[PDB]
Amino acid sequence: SRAIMDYQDRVTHMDENDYKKIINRAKEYNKQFKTSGMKWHMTSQERLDYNSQLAIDKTGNMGYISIPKINIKLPLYHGTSEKVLQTSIGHLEGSSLPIGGDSTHSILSGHRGLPSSRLFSDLDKLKVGDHWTVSILNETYTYQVDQIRTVKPDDLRDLQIVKGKDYQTLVTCTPYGVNTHRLLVRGHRVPND
Prior knowledge:
The chain is of the alpha+beta class. The chain has 5 helices and 8 strands, in the order ααααββαββββββ. A hairpin with a 4-residue loop joins strand 1 and strand 2 (72-78). The longest helix is centred in the first third of the chain and has 15 residues, at 16-30. The PDB classes it as hydrolase. The entry lists the keywords hydrolase, pilus, gram-positive.
């Protein structure tokens, strides 16, 4: 959790105009999805823009996710490279940034456990009604489970932009140790506690 400590410490010394610039750019970014839908076919240009969003250093670390029910607190990174997923949670690069907004759908991915790290091992313990939060800069974003689906790897029907909705889906492999399917835990934006 040193990544999280380092991230927190960095945010502590940012000007309040620093938050505003970064948050505003991320909001502007997330505005595109209402017309564009998911950006499965992301161009080099778009990928460069993406990497600059919610970035306060060169690590790719966007913030961190908290799932009290299963005792997870992990750093969130740009993209879903094997490097990222070996120790942290990845953000699917063509999905909306995890600050939500109207007509957005952010997708976060994590291995269903590795030899010495739980990651999203216990994602199956989550139930409709449960909450998680993502912390980005000085702000909190809360999501509440409203749909749980198990699907084939190529089924992207539950992973689309829905107009007038603010969604975040947590994705991992399933069954545990078999990994033939994908477990999708969708939540919608709710007010912070």
